[PDB]
């Protein structure tokens, strides 16, 4: 299964300055486009190498559409300040996320259109892509306006249809990066302090996609009592990293075992000292 | 590809 998602952030600036507007498109865990309102270009720009293939017609059209989003938000920032009776002095953030999930069969699975004001859920499309869910009277005002203008209908068409076709096109034309699965290059490092304890670090480097599981075990028995896991982090080269640690008595080192589960592995791996 | 349909403000 794959997905395409667009992330739009627009931040109001008090007095002099138009709102900072940043837009980014992801296929799975791979960024392929950006638009920055403070960029010299004032153009949609590629991130992955595979989207660069696209002709002038795509970049003109994507720039045009994404500028309309930026103008839509500029007006939204205003309206919301008016709905919540807030100062012109105050700075505020809108965030818009939408996209589509497809199965293994590349057919439509889920669509979503979520919208936030100051890091808080404002209004969202339900699963059935017909009714809206508001957070407050202000979002309810937007809901009534969006019911009457038949918005759900217009967005659904994109989400069920065009979104899925964009995704297929990208998976197809960028097969060599997007449809690839890099196995995690796993190793293990030993640190300790006197006889107080010992610590093993279960490294897992240069892997895609990002979803992964690093567990520890003691005599084939899962251990979560004396472990330290970090959030999955990007190496920056398209791949991801992670490490789980564990604290043990000095001499028990061999008893402890780290299990790695990933999409691009045949069977879950297993490591000891 | 960015949503090509009608834009509605809140």
């Amino acid at each position, epitope marked *: 299964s794959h997905s395409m998602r667009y992330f739009f952030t627009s931040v109001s600036r008090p007095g002099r300055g138009e709102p900072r507007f940043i837009a980014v498109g992801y296929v799975d865990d791979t960024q392929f486009v950006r638009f920055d309102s403070d960029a010299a270009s004032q153009r949609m720009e590629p991130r992955a190498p595979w989207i660069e293939q696209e002709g002038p017609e795509y970049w003109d*059209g994507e720039t045009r559409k994404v500028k309309a989003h930026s*103008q839509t938000h500029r007006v939204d920032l205003g309206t919301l300040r008016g709905y919540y009776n807030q100062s012109e002095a105050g700075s505020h953030t809108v965030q818009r996320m939408y996209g589509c999930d497809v199965g293994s069969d590349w057919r439509f699975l889920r669509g979503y259109h979520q919208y936030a004001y100051d890091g808080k859920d404002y209004i969202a499309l339900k699963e059935d892509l017909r009714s809206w869910t508001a957070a407050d009277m202000a979002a309810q005002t937007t809901k009534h306006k969006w019911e009457a203008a038949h918005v759900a209908e217009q967005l659904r068409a994109y989400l069920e249809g*065009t979104c899925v*076709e964009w995704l297929r096109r990208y998976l197809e034309n960028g097969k060599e990066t997007l449809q690839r699965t890099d196995a995690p290059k796993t190793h293990m490092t030993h640190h300790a302090v006197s006889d107080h304890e010992a610590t093993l670090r279960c490294w897992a480097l240069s892997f895609y996609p990002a979803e992964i599981t690093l567990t520890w075990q003691r005599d084939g028995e899962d251990q979560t009592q004396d472990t330290e896991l970090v959030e999955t982090r990007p190496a920056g080269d398209g791949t991801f990293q992670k490490w789980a640690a564990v604290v043990v008595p000095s001499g028990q080192e061999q008893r402890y075992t780290c299990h790695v589960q990933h999409e691009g592995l045949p069977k879950p791996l297993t490591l000891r000292w | 590809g960015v949503y090509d*349909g009608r*834009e509605h403000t809140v």
Partner: T-cell receptor
Amino acid sequence: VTQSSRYLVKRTGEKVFLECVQDMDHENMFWYRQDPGLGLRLIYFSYDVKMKEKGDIPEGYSVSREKKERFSLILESASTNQTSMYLCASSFLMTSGDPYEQYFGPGTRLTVTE
Amino acid sequence: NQVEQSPQSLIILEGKNVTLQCNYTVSPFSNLRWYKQDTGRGPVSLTIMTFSENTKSNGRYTATLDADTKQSSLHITASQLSDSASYICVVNHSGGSYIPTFGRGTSLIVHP
């Protein structure tokens, strides 16, 4: 969506001005010509006021879009090969309305003769 | 062209059911419309169809879309002289041009 005239006959080398007006506040405006066998073909596309894009067949034609409610087609120098049915159209911008609902004018029969 | 219609013309007897076919290349795809056009006149919209809309029985007219195969049909049941007209298939690209892609049309002549 209206057009200047419904029938025109013109000598070659005349600068012909086919006008197209709409009071529907549309930003998008189109100049098409319909010849038998080929159907409609885009001459020029004005996306918003004071904008211009070359169509499939821009050669021999110019356009003015100084006001929003008027899109002006210009045969710089008239020629027999511009004897055609000329159709105007107008849609909204994505931000204004349904961007894909194209509204058509009645059409104009222009015969250019030497 | 990226929108082909077939046949380029057909002459059907009145009361016969007729089908007007339309194959498109336009990718990616946003909406398809079927226009009716009498001689000397503007095109008049019959149906618009998104991916999430297959079928519409608009009286004696029935429009059909298969977005996966990039194909649409316009069935007309029990044809009559008034159905005689040019039937245009128009498809909209999702790229950002907002310039629709026209088929060259099909001429339906219904003989009595």
